Every structure is written in C-alpha cells, then in structure tokens.
Amino acid sequence: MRECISIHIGQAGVQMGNACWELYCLEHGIQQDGIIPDDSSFGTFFSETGSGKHVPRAVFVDLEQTVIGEIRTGHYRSLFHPEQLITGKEDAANNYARGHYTIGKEIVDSVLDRVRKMADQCSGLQGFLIFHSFGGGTGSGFTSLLMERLSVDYGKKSKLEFSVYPAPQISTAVVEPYNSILTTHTTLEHSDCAFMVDNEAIYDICNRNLDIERPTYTNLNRLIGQIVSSITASLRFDGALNVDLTEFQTNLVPYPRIHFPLVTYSPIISAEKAYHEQLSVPEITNACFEYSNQMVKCDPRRGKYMACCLLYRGDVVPKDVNAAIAAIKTRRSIQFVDWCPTGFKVGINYQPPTVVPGGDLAKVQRAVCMLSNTTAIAEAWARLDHKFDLMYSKRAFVHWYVGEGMEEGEFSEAREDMAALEKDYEEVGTES
Amino acid sequence: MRECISIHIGQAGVQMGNACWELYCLEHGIQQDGIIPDDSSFGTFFSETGSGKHVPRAVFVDLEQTVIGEIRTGHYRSLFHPEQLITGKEDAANNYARGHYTIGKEIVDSVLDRVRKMADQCSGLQGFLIFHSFGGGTGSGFTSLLMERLSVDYGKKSKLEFSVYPAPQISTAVVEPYNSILTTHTTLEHSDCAFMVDNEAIYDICNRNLDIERPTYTNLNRLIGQIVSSITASLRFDGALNVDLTEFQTNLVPYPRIHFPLVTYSPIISAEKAYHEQLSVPEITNACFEYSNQMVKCDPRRGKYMACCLLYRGDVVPKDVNAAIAAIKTRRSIQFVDWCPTGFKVGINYQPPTVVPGGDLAKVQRAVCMLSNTTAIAEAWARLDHKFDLMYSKRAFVHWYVGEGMEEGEFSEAREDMAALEKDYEEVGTES
Amino acid sequence: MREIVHLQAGQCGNQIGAKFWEVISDEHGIDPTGTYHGDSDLQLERINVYYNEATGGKYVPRAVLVDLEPGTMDSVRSGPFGQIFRPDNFVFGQSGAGNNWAKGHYTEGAELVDSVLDVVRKEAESCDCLQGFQLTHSLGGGTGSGMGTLLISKIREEYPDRIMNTFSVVPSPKVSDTVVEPYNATLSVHQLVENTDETYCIDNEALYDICFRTLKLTTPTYGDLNHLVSATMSGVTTCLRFPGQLNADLRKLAVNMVPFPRLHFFMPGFAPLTSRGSQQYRALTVPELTQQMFDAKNMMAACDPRHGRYLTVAAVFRGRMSMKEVDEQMLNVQNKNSSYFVEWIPNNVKTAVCDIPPRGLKMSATFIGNSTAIQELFKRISEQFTAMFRRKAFLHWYTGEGMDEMEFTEAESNMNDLVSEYQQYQDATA
Amino acid sequence: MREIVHLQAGQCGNQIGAKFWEVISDEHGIDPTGTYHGDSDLQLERINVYYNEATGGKYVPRAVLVDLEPGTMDSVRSGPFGQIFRPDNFVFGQSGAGNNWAKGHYTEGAELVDSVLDVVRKEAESCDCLQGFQLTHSLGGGTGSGMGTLLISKIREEYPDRIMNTFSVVPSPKVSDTVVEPYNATLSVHQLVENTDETYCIDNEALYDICFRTLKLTTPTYGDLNHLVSATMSGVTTCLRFPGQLNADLRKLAVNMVPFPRLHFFMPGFAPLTSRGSQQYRALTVPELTQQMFDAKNMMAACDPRHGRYLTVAAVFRGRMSMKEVDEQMLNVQNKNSSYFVEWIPNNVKTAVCDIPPRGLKMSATFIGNSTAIQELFKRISEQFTAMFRRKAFLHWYTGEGMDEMEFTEAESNMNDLVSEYQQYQDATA
Numbered sequence A, B: 001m002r003e004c005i006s007i008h009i010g011q012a013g014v015q016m017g018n019a020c021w022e023l024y025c026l027e028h029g030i031q032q033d034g035i036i037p038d039d040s041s042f043g044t045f046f047s048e049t050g051s052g053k054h055v056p057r058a059v060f061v062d063l064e065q066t067v068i069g070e071i072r073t074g075h076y077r078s079l080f081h082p083e084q085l086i087t088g089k090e091d092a093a094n095n096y097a098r099g100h101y102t103i104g105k106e107i108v109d110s111v112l113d114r115v116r117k118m119a120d121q122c123s124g125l126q127g128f129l130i131f132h133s134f135g136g137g138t139g140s141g142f143t144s145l146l147m148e149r150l151s152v153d154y155g156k157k158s159k160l161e162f163s164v165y166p167a168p169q170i171s172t173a174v175v176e177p178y179n180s181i182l183t184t185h186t187t188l189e190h191s192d193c194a195f196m197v198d199n200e201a202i203y204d205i206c207n208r209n210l211d212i213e214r215p216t217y218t219n220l221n222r223l224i225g226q227i228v229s230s231i232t233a234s235l236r237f238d239g240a241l242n243v244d245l246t247e248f249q250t251n252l253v254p255y256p257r258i259h260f261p262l263v264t265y266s267p268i269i270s271a272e273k274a275y276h277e278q279l280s281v282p283e284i285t286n287a288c289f290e291y292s293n294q295m296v297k298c299d300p301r302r303g304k305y306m307a308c309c310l311l312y313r314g315d316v317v318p319k320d321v322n323a324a325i326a327a328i329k330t331r332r333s334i335q336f337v338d339w340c341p342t343g344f345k346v347g348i349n350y351q352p353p354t355v356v357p358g359g360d361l362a363k364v365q366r367a368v369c370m371l372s373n374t375t376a377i378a379e380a381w382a383r384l385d386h387k388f389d390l391m392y393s394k395r396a397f398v399h400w401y402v403g404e405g406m407e408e409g410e411f412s413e414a415r416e417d418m419a420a421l422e423k424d425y426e427e428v429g430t431e432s
Numbered sequence C, D: 001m002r003e004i005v006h007l008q009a010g011q012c013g014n015q016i017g018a019k020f021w022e023v024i025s026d027e028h029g030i031d032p033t034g035t036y037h038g039d040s041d042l043q044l045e046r047i048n049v050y051y052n053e054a055t056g057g058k059y060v061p062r063a064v065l066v067d068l069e070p071g072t073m074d075s076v077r078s079g080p081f082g083q084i085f086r087p088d089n090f091v092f093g094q095s096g097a098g099n100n101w102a103k104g105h106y107t108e109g110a111e112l113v114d115s116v117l118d119v120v121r122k123e124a125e126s127c128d129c130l131q132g133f134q135l136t137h138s139l140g141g142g143t144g145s146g147m148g149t150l151l152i153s154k155i156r157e158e159y160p161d162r163i164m165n166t167f168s169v170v171p172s173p174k175v176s177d178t179v180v181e182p183y184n185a186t187l188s189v190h191q192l193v194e195n196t197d198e199t200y201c202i203d204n205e206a207l208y209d210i211c212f213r214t215l216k217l218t219t220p221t222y223g224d225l226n227h228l229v230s231a232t233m234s235g236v237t238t239c240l241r242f243p244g245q246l247n248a249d250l251r252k253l254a255v256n257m258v259p260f261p262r263l264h265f266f267m268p269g270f271a272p273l274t275s276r277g278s279q280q281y282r283a284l285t286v287p288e289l290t291q292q293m294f295d296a297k298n299m300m301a302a303c304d305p306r307h308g309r310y311l312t313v314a315a316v317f318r319g320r321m322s323m324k325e326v327d328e329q330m331l332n333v334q335n336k337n338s339s340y341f342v343e344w345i346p347n348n349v350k351t352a353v354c355d356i357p358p359r360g361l362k363m364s365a366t367f368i369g370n371s372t373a374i375q376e377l378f379k380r381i382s383e384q385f386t387a388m389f390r391r392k393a394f395l396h397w398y399t400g401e402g403m404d405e406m407e408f409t410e411a412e413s414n415m416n417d418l419v420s421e422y423q424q425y426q427d428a429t430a
C-alpha cells in the first residue's frame, strides 16, 4: 500500500507523536536503534535505506526547543533523521498571532522544504496526518499556516488531523477560547476531517475503565496511539474489506463544514480485569455507543449520529460484525439522522493490537474503533463560542494579539464564522 | 436450559448470596478460583470465557461498603467480575426513604447498567432472582427501585424474589413495621411471587432438627441455599418432569396480589442423627405439612392451602410421589380451599443435594422442597399492620422519613393498601 | 469511607480524648509514634476511619483538641501518647474560662472558635465520605459548655446533614465539683436540644459506683473512669472499623434510638465489668452478659431506669457470638420486664454484632438506652436552677460577659418543656 | 536558547540576588568556584540559561549588580559565594542614595546608569536568543526605586519586545523601615506601570507571617525571607531549564496573567512550607499542596485575596506529578470559591508541570495570582502620599535634586487611575 506522511506540531503533537512511533516500531518489530532485526507493510510509514536502518516518514516542528530536545536525546535519537526534528528559538506563548503571523512564518518555509523533499521521494502519497492542539500558539497558529500552505502545493490530497479539542470544564490555559476558535475559522476550509479528542474524557475513561488512579500524558498518549494505529492498520496489514485513507472523508463528511467525527475505542480493560471478561464482538461493538466511552466529553444521546466508520481489528468474524451493527440500528435510544439511512462503514484487518512493554491496557485478541460524526458536538462549539463571547465582550486580552500583527476584525470574523457553523449543524439535525 | 440472573441487595442479600454461590460451585465442581478442573448445566448461572474461568451471572449491590468488601477480599475474590460487586459510600440507615428516594437513586442507574450488559449477553433470559430483606434501608428501599426499574425495561419477564420477612416476635431493629410495609406496597404490583422466610422459624428448626445449639447467619444462609438450589435445579440438571422458572407463578399465584408462598424444606437432619432414619419418600413428604417445619413461623392449620409446588430431588420414584401426595389430600387436618381441587405441582430432578464441606446437614440421598401458598400468612400481615398502627398513631418516627424526601401520605397509603390485602386474603379463604 | 472526625473540648474532654486514642491505637496496633505494628489485616482495612496517613507509615489521628488555656493540652502533648497528634490540631488560648458559660460562649470562645473551624475543615475535606462529627466535653464547666455548645452550633450550620454525636459529662445528682453547674448545664441543654443528633449523658457519681461495686479498685478516679468511657464510645463506632454479621452505624442507632427530634439523650452501659480476682469465678456466655446491661448497677448515668420506661434500646455486641443467643435473650428481656417498655412502640431493642472483640476480651457489648427516667435529671437541674435564679445568685458574672437574664428564662422554659415531653410518654396506649 | 539576564539593584536587590544564585547553583550542582560537579545531565543541557562559560568549566552567571555605594556589594564580593560573579559586573558608585527617589533617578543614578548598560549589552549580545530581563529591587528605598526605575525604563527603550519581569519589595501595610516610603513608592509605581511587563509584589510583613505561623522559626529575618523569595522566583523560570510535560515561559504567564497592560501586579505564593519537626505529620500529595496556595495564610503579599476577586491565576508545579490530580484539584478550587473569581473570564487557572523538583524536595508549586484585592495596597499608599503631600512634608529634599512637585501630582493622579481600574472589575457580567 502507498505512503502516508505524519506532521506533528506543537508540544502536544511532538509528545503525542513519540507515543505513536513507539507502537509502529513494535507492530513491525523495528528496534529503537532504527535497525530491523536480522515486510512490505512498513513501507507506508518507514522509508528504506541502503543499510538496515529504516527512517520514519514524519516531520516534527515546535517553536520551543525544549520539547523536541527530549526526543533528540532520548532512546529514539537514532530513529529520526536529524533534519526532520525542526525546532525554533522561542515559544509562541499560547498566542495565535505569534504562531501564525510573526514567528510562525519565520520557520514555516523550513518545514515545507522537508515536507516536499519527503513528499517527492514517494511514487504515490495518500495524504498527511497532522497532530496539534487548539489550546496552544504553535499547535493552533503554526498549524493554520501549514494547512494553508499544504492546501496549495499539495491540493486535492488527503489531510487528516487528530486534534486536542479544548475540554468542557478543565483547562490548562486561560486564552483557549480565543486561540481555539481562531484556528477553527482558518482550518474549516483547509482540512478533510478532524478527529477531536478531549483530555477530560480520556482521563475519565482511564480512571473509570483502565482502573489506574494517577494517569499522566505519557499514559494518555499511548491510548491515543491505539486509535491512530487502528485507523492506519488498513494501510499496512492485509485483511478483508480494507479501508483506505481517503475513504474516511467520503463516509464521515456529508458537508464540507461538518467534518468533526469524535473518536471512540474499545476495549479499554486492564490486564487483571480482562481475565473476568469474554470480549465478544457485540460486547466491544456496543461499548462504543454509550456516552461513558468517548474521547470527546460529549453525550451522543443529546444529538444524532449522521455517519459512522467502524474499523475492526484482530481475529474478527464479519458475520458477527454484521449482526452486531444491525442490532444498534434498531434501538430507540440510538438515533440516526433522517436523511442518512445508510450510516455505517465497516473495516477489518487481520492484525491484533500490540501491547507496549510495561503498558497498562491488556493484550486484547480483538478491538474496534469508531469515528462517528454526531450533531451533539455542536454543543461543544456553542459552549466555546459562549466562553469566547464573555471575554471579547469586554476586550480582555486582544492587546496581546493586536501587537503581534493581527487585525482587530479577525476576532469578529472568527465568531461570526463559528456562529454559522452552529446554524449549519442545527439544520442538518432536522428533516426537510 | 436458558439463563437466570441473580440480584443480591442489602446486607442480607449479599451475605445470603455468598452462601448460594458456594453451593453452585460445588454442584458443578467449580474451583473457588473460578477455573473448572481439567457441563451444559452451568451455562444457566455461569458465563463462559476464552479461558477456563467461568463468571457468575449475578450482581451484588449494597449502599454500605463494609459487607461487599468481605467478599472482595475473601477466597471468592477471583470468582466475581470486579464490576459486578457494586458498593456505595454510606449506609441507608434502616431508612426506607434513603434507600428509595435520596441515596438509592444515586446508584440505581449503575446497577441497571450492569444488569443490561449482563442481560443483553444471553440469547434467552428466564428472569431475575432477587434476594433482599424487608427490615433494612437498602434491602427495602433500594429493592423497590429495582423492582420498578426492572418492570419497565424488562417487563413480561419473571422476577422471583426470596425475602427475609420480619419475624413475629424477635426483631433486630425498631423500624421494621414502617420499612417492611412500605416495600410491600410498592413490590405488590412489580413482582411475580415472593418466597418469604423468617429467621425465627429457621432458628427454631436449626435447634429443633439440626440439633446444634448455637447457630449463626453463616449457618442459616447455607440452609437457605438449599431451597434456592432445589428450586433452580430443574434449570441445570436433567430429570423427569422438569419445572421451569416461569411455571411457579402460574401454579402458586391464583390472583396478582396473593403471591406469598412460604418456603418449606425436608429433610433437615444431622449427620449422626440420620443413621437412625430411613428417609422414605412419604416420610420427607409428610414432614412438610406440619407447622414445626416451616421457614416462616406461621401455622398452616390456622389457614387453608390454595397452591403447592413440590420440587423433589435425587433418586425419586414418582410412583411413591403420587401415592404420598394422594394421602395428604385425604386428611381432615390438611385443608385446601374449596375452589382449587387441583392443588399440587410436582417436579423431579436426578441430582441429589450436595453437602458443603464442613456443613452441618447430612448427605441425603433424596430431598423435597415445598412452596405452598396459604391464607394463614394473612395473620402475619395483620400483625405487621398492627405494629405499624401502634407507632404511626402517635407519629413516632416519621420525621426521619419526611426529612428524606418522603411525603407524609405515603404511610397512610401504605397501610390502606395492606388493609385491602387483608380483605383480599379473607375473601379467598371462603367459598362463594 | 464513612470517616469520623473527633472533637474534644474542655479539661474533661481532652483527658477523655487522650484515653480515647490510647484505646483505638491499641485496637489497630498503632505504635505511639504512629507506626503500624498490628497482626491482623482488618486493622488497616478501616484504619482510615480515624487515622489519616503520611508517607513512611505515620498514621495521623484527626482529632481536634481545643481549650481556652494551655494547661491541660500541654500535659497531653508531653504525655507519652502526645507525639501522635498533628501539632497543628492543638488549638490553645491564653485566658481560660472561669467556669462561666458566657465567657466561653460570647466573649472568649467567640475569639477562638474561628480558628478551630479552620482546622475542622481541613480534616473535613481530607475525607472522601465524612459520616459525622464526634464531640466530648462537660456541661458543668465553662469551656466544655460555652465553646463546646458554640462549636457544635457552628458545625451544625455548615454540616446540617452529617451526624454529630456527643459523649458529655452531666452534673452529678448530689455531689458537685462546681458551684455554677445549674447555670452552665441549663444553658448547655437548651443549646444541644436543637443541634445534637444524639447525646450520651454520663456522670461521675454513677461511674464511681462501678469502680467499687462491680469492680474492686478504690485507688483511681480519673485514670480509669475515662477508660470505661473510652471503651464505651469505641464500641459504638466498631461497626465502621471491623466486619460484622449485622453492621451498625451512627445513623442506624439515631433512627432506632431517636423517636422524636427533642428526645435524643441516652445513657450508656458497658459489659463485662469484672474484677481481675473474681473474673475466673464467672462465665463469659451471652446470657449473663445481657443480664447486667438492664440493671441500674451497670448504668453510667445517675438515673435509674426502673423509675421510668424505655423508649428505644440498642445493643452492639462484639466478638464471635451466636446470633440466636444474641436474639433469644432480648426477647426474654422484653417479656420479663414488660412494664419497663412503652407499649406504643412494639419493639424497643436494636442489635448489632461485630466479629472482632475489644482488646483483651473475646466478648463485649455496649448498651445505649433511651429512657424517660432521664427526665428526673433535667427536672433536678431545673429545681436547682430556679432556686439560685430566684434570687439572682450569680447572674452578675454572666450578665457582665455579654449576656441577658432573658436567656436564662428561655433556657429554663425550654428545659421545662423537655421534662414535660418525656412525662407524656409514661402513659400506656389509649 | 531563551537566555535570561539578571539585574539586581539596591541593598535589598543584591541580598535577594545573592541568595538567588546560591539556590540556582545548588540546582545545577555548580560549585561556588564555578566548577560543575552535578550528577544529572539535564543540569548542563540548559545551564546556559543563567550561566555563561569559560574554558576549564568555569561557569559565569550573567548577573548585573548595581548599587550607589560599595557597602552592600563588598559584602557580596567577600561572601563565600562572591567568587563566582564576573568582577566586571559589579557596578559600584561612591555616594549612595539617601532614600530620596530624585537623587537615585535624576542626579546620581543618571551619572551611573550609562555604565550599567555597557555591562548589560555585553551580556545581551553574548546570548543567542535573549528572552527577557529580570530585575530585583525595593520600591521604598532610593537606589532600588530611583535607579531601578531609571534602568528599567532604559532597557525598555532598547529592548521593547523582550520580556522584563520584576520581583519587587513593596512597603508593608502598617510597619515601615523608612519615612519617605509613600513618596518613593508612589513615584516608582507611576514609572513601572508603563515599562514592566509583570511585577511580583511582595512585602516583609506578609512574609514574616510565614516564618512563625506556618513555619516555627523565630530567629532569622533576612537570611531566610530572601530564601523563600529565591525559591519562588526560581520556580517561575524552571520550565526554561528542565524538561516538563507542559512547559511554561515568562511570556506564557504574562499572556495568561495580564488581561490589560496596566494590570500586571501579581502576588506570589509558594508551597510546601512545613517546619522540620511537623513535616513528618503531613502528606506530600497534590491535593493538600494545592489547598494552601489559595489561602491568605500562604500569600507573600499583605493583601488578602478574600476581599477581592481573582482575574487570572497561574500554577507552576514541579516533580513527578499526576497531571490528572494537577487538573482535578483546580476545577475543584474554582467551583468551591466561585465568588473569588470574576465571571467575565471563563477560566482563571494556568497550569505548568516540570519533571525535576527543587533541591531537597519531590514536589513543589509556585502560585502567581492577579487579584483586584491588590488595589487596597495602592489605595493605602495614596492615602499616605496625599496626607504627607497635603502639607509638603518632605518635598524640599526631592525638589532640590532636580524635580518638580508637578511630577508628584502626576504620580498621584496616575496611581489613582490604577486603583479605579482595578475597582471596575469587581462587578459581575451585565
């Protein structure tokens, strides 16, 4: 199968990316030194070399030298090509303007140079994977630059993105409403579909299901690796009814703006706890249609589903998949939209998930991941617009952004654009 | 045969349930670790797994963490799925209002989640077994919640319950009249038939027949396990004239409200004492029609039988069963109601009762259990209504219940409902 | 899980508190330094009910020790067992109360009370489920009554729902270690009836009787009476710390033992109480254990139950005990003494059994009784209060500390109604 | 990479500076001679943030020490830790300021200021990315206010974009070590509001309270208060020196903690602050650590946050800490104290975690709070300023050193507007 590029932006992207590439090395049995022990699958994410040392086909960018420096000196130092790890001199300071107008453009061209040199060295290219955070300067301002630049030079190629959408209540910053909304305004027209995830939801699942009281980002990012691994498994491992990268956008994006399918995964069970469970196909399948198992803390029952992609993994009997999916279609609580009778997309690969050494989650013989697109997510956008309106009403933090070469009206346009997004979701939630 | 779920509520239910599941493991030869030694019967009460460790199909709920914690750390810790053992943070304080209105509803939804996930994983489901106590807050207030909830989501499915009806004279609490009557008002319309048992009666039998002077709840609950095992034996072991779970309600419930068949068992003989006995079929059969062998301290001779189910066990010659039952029908002291000429229901299974290691009762080759429904039980209800009227006449304890979100009129309605129950029993005791 | 926070006020409270933790630390095998050395795992399973934890095994008992003068607390701190308490918990003043209720309630307790809540709240938010508060004081004194009633009133406002039980020393019927006991006691009762869920009225005179009558030990007064009290209160909270066949709880006893809100003053009792030399001449079976609970010989209150009638009764047994014997004897007691129990309550006995016995014994039981005979005590206090107040015996000390004589009339009128209410429940049904 | 250059002026600044480098040198394992002897490699990875380098391993901390009289600096030079500073950095005069702002700002600081920039620029061009400047002084004095405000104004002109944070001692609410503190303080504030990006207002009186109240150590005043201050400022700059899960920065806090340009005066706090003897009676878990940050007991400013409302809050945790607990507790704090936070800002807490803890601890956190309660402080200074100025109390000393009374009116009018602005943000939304 053909290659796919991964672009990791900001502290969230870089830190999350390291978790992902630990899994890939384990799936293909690649040593952390880069040298495979003494096949055709890894070509999609790994580039060959005359020696036995394969090179990951990813690029890391961060305006702050601190985060990447840990990778550059860690046990994966020899895995990455030294020029891929791009580092700036000063952080964006949780400022959208800095990472998008003043300092973001100083290093944007350097990143493109490595993307082009890496994109040109593949006969075919499915698209780009992009990891970033709405609640940062680099992960929100610099990302918007790449989305725009990657839309012109490589237009009409897939651009999938996993994003850390701001949590409903918890918050590790103060300017999340301003920064998060601004990037959504610019990334709406320059993206295919965004796989939102909330740290609040992942923390809740970790304490609720994984049964560990004291998690950390090093733990959550490993869970986030699973959804990426299952999503991209079809591009590496053989299996009946493989799902390509470009198939997600067609199935999960009815309209250009409505491209926010929240992520879900199953089963998340601790090693000891799993011995008391059966893990049948319906069990894992029905575990993804409850508001207690979501990576974004939104209640699906509040809204309506309008598209769902199921990417089954491991030793799966598709007959059971057909039966399990049929049952979910005939439950009153589960509610799909009126104008989408055909609201599922199945995918199976014969490769059970791998367990990172010392990992928390168990060695499941079978797993499933869902990418449902639900109008209940409009609640999150409305809440974010509400928080944004509270601050900008008094003009409480704009002086930081205006001084960074950002026009005043951008905030006005940003909210108005999100206002239309709310109405667009509302109309889709009804029937004509 | 098809599955049946067990729901254990309150300290009585949890403590009684542990006694039951000790018997089941012994009957099927299941190790306490959960792993069967190195067949189709256990599927009704045990769920299979990829490994050899079967999981009991039961749920334990208790608002006080203390009782279940003993199970969670006992020798049966590995037998139960960790999520089945549901525990609250504070006890209901022998208050019907707390376990039904304020704190009961905080954890009721959690129990349903495990009931649904366990009820959905069975192709067929006979019904639910429910163990509780009238004289508690959790066992009376929280139970009523489940009976109501289990009546809607799973209506038209069997709901059998074994209950610790308040004893006539002995009492381990002061508010038994208020609490016991309240649940009866709510559980009358949301139950099939309740197998009442009194600790006073069981203590009397234990000292009278088992010939041990110093019993304890750990001993009585083992006796209560026998009636459950014999009742459900037809669903596990092969035998002529098997009796299904739903057959009890049809035979023993002439009218919707008259569904209180008191339990009886035979033979209860000590190991040493049994060597001097023959244990013929009529002997055990005639031992169940005397007021000295009952689990509820009520005299059948005071009232009249109106339905009886006999569940014989072990190597039984049904011809002797037919002859023994016929004799009981032609004794003046034994008195059935006029309008029920056909007042018996036989059941036989080829599986002799098993002896718990270190148990008191002997290894009987044959046994019998009766579920007679008698109008003499109206005496117990009248006594309970008498005790209730003494207290509520002066309004002696309502302030505890009113402060727990309970309207005053509930006591008035509760007694009036029980008053009609007395008249309903009275009419059935005569002939038109 | 069901955390209890302990409050001790006044000289009597701290000393009772001090011997209250020497007993619990013995049950859980906790060294005076705070290091666990027990043998049974059940001790740790519920050690969080009283003791917090600090890395290295140091277990910190969340008691809050408050007094208006450093005297008594300095003794506790210098005590052998004083190294366990968190130094931040000791709340000490600099001008103790001179046994006048007003000073410890209006002018001096008011200045120090705000500091105590700052220490309760920290112990309150450090508990995942806080069940209720515990308080030990003396009505006769000034600090155990003034600030004790002031503090119990405050914790009622913030934690109305939580339980709050009080083990309180009551003035003796005939002997008195203070002259103003009626004034102080009368004001204290008027202030507890509205705030405290359950009160355990005890008095030295009755508790003295146990020392020489059923035991044979004349030398000690305060080193041992407090130890009998400590064992009693430990029995009440045992169900929250060890497994039991029929587990009880502070809320379970309140519901069973409190028919009406204003009738919550009980009188405890403990058994077995045998002398070391006569112990070998006695059986330790359940029947005999239960006989002495209902006799005025083993009642830690000055009021004899015979003169009145029981309203509600609770027993909390301990150890490996046959529940049949635990229940047959109570039915026996009710029938033998049918005149001692009110008819309008069909059943008056509440039972609870814990598997683990108290240290140094294999069987025990704590009696808690709500009897109308306790009205004699308040009746007596009112007789003394009205006599002194009839001529303004000492009102000038109390008025001069921010108080009014109208409050005394309210305290006397409210007390008179409590006596009247208990009297209504002497008549039989109809 | 993100270099910081340290400025210390006045007697207070140098002494705080002096104990500021004894702490950092301990974190990086730097011997007083400038020779590295640390154990962990992370110390060297960012040692260039504060320390330059000279062949042979000699690490030169780029601090610039300026004072108008050699007295204090000679002590630092003769100090045990004085061998580390580059002799060329000490900028010493020969006629110190007599606590009059005009002399240290117009007639005497003017003559010496040009020399200091010649030393800043060398430390400025020796850094590949200079993040921002750091300044430590005292408003009350003459050198920490006169020249400190003169120098901070100059470095603003050349480096407008660079960050410039100030740890400044503020006059105490009731005690005063100088008579002209209102004049000096009032002029200093009027001069910082326009130049300084973020200021950390601290006062001895509040910091004294920590010594005896939460700690139990009465002997020291200046040898230890400076050490608490040094630990606080070290926490703020930790993210630029060690790896962290959520790395922070001087610019990140400014954006989060500075809604409007003229509202940048915070008030720091540090934890844990336990006495050596009571430390073993306390848990070191995240929840308790976070509780004491928001109580006026552990605030290094004289202003109590309760009287006002928080606008923005920043926490910088350290050590191996569970980020879930780091985040659940803050949500808990916001809801419990919803009246303490302004509604027109949906979220008021900023978090940052560093993996490496401070020397001698496994957990720590530095609180930075922007509260409108700080307006009380300026309001108080204005009350004192207007009273003295109403009769020309000391203006003759200030006028005679090249100054005009019109400047005092401007300083009073500008100060009055700062107080008014903070007052506008007490009302709720709509």
Ligand SMILES: Nc1nc2c(ncn2[C@@H]2O[C@H](COP(=O)(O)OP(=O)(O)OP(=O)(O)O)[C@@H](O)[C@H]2O)c(=O)[nH]1
Pocket: A009, A010, A011, A012, A013, A015, A016, A063, A064, A091, A092, A093, A094, A095, A133, A134, A135, A136, A137, A138, A139, A140, A164, A171, A172, A173, A199, A217, A218, A220, A221, A224, D245, D246
């Ligand atoms: N899941 C996950 N989220 C992270 C991780 N690290 C940071 N985040 C999220 O990132 C959000 C803020 O954006 P950051 O990534 O920290 O900031 P940035 O992208 O580096 O941009 P700057 O502010 O210029 O540093 C926080 O709210 C975190 O929730 C991580 O390792 N895993």
Ligand SMILES: Nc1nc2c(ncn2[C@@H]2O[C@H](COP(=O)(O)OP(=O)(O)OP(=O)(O)O)[C@@H](O)[C@H]2O)c(=O)[nH]1
Pocket: B009, B010, B011, B012, B013, B015, B016, B063, B064, B091, B092, B093, B094, B095, B133, B134, B135, B136, B137, B138, B139, B140, B164, B171, B172, B173, B199, B217, B218, B220, B221, B224, C245, C246
């Ligand atoms: N047969 C039997 N009965 C029991 C057992 N444990 C408790 N009971 C009965 O339960 C009755 C009181 O109800 P409980 O179960 O104790 O109280 P609860 O259901 O836990 O409700 P709470 O008051 O909130 O704790 C007592 O009168 C006992 O007779 C037991 O192990 N076996």
Ligand SMILES: Nc1nc2c(ncn2[C@@H]2O[C@H](COP(=O)(O)OP(=O)(O)O)[C@@H](O)[C@H]2O)c(=O)[nH]1
Pocket: C009, C010, C011, C012, C013, C015, C016, C097, C098, C099, C138, C140, C141, C142, C143, C144, C145, C169, C177, C178, C204, C222, C225, C226
């Ligand atoms: N049981 C017991 N009672 C005590 C003890 N010390 C004092 N008391 C009682 O407490 C009363 C005196 O109260 P006190 O604490 O001295 O007054 P206060 O501290 O000023 O409020 C006396 O009536 C004593 O009977 C003791 O060690 N044990």
Ligand SMILES: Nc1nc2c(ncn2[C@@H]2O[C@H](COP(=O)(O)OP(=O)(O)O)[C@@H](O)[C@H]2O)c(=O)[nH]1
Pocket: D009, D010, D011, D012, D013, D015, D016, D097, D098, D099, D138, D140, D141, D142, D143, D144, D145, D169, D177, D178, D204, D222, D225, D226
């Ligand atoms: N924290 C701290 N403050 C100090 C120290 N020395 C002086 N101060 C404060 O600084 C003020 C005096 O300022 P000073 O430096 O003497 O004036 P100047 O040097 O002439 O500008 C006083 O209000 C002191 O509170 C110290 O060692 N530590």
Ligand SMILES: [Mg+2]
Pocket: A010, A011, A064, A091, A092, A136, A138, D247
């Ligand atoms: Mg960053």
Ligand SMILES: [Mg+2]
Pocket: B010, B011, B064, B091, B092, B136, B138, C247
């Ligand atoms: Mg219970």
